[PDB]
Amino acid sequence: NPKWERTNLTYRIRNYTPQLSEAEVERAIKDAFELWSVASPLIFTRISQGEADINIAFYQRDHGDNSPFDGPNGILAHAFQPGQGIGGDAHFDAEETWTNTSANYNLFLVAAHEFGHSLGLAHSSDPGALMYPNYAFRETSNYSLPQDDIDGIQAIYG
C-alpha cells in the first residue's frame, strides 16, 4: 500500500495528442487531478519542463517500460504506484480516439482513473466506482468522485 510521503506533488505533460487542442488536454488532466484533491490533503502543481513527480505522456506500442500498448481499443492506458522515477507516472495509448465528449474515449475519465493508481489506489469491485477495472462513460460536467473512491484515497492518506 505504498503512498507518497509528500502532499504537494508536481506533474508534467510531456506531449499531446493531435485529437484535441492543447488547452483541452491540460484542462482534462487539470480537472482529473482536482477530483482526488477535494477528497484528500493532496495538492497538485503543474510544471512546463523539468523533473516532476507524475509524468503524463502519450505513447504507442513499445515505449520503454516492458508494458507495450496495443493499438486502438483494449488497453486505454496505465500508471505506476507511488515511488521514484517511473513510480507515479501515467502513460496514455496514443493510438486511441481521445475525445471531450461521451464518445470513446473520454480523456478526463481515463486520466482520473490512472491518477488514482499513481496516488496508490487499486481496483474496485463496485461498478459505479471510478476505480472500476473497465471503462464506462459518466456525465463529465459537474462530475464528482464516487463514494467508494472517496473512501479510497481517504483510507490511504487523509
Which residues are documented as binding site for Zn(2+)? 63, 65, 78, 91, 113, 117, 123
- 91 forms part of the interface with Zn ion (CB under 5 A): yes
Report 108-147 residues binding ligand JST (CB under 6 A): 113, 117
Among 50-58, 73-81, 92-100, 138-146, which window interacts with ligand JST (CB under 6 A)? 73-81
- 79 forms part of the interface with ligand JST (CB under 6 A): yes
Is residue 95 part of the annotated active site? The answer reads: no
- 94 forms part of the interface with ligand JST (CB under 6 A): no
- 70 forms part of the interface with Zn ion (CB under 5 A): no
Query: Could you give the C-alpha distances from 37 to 17, 40, 45, 139, 157, in angstroms and in order?
Result: 25, 5, 11, 19, 11
- Judge whether 118 and 54 are in contact, CB under 8 Å: yes
Cβ-Cβ contacts under 8 Å for 18 (sequence gap 6 or more):
none
Which uninterrupted H or E stretch holds 35?
A: helix 22-37
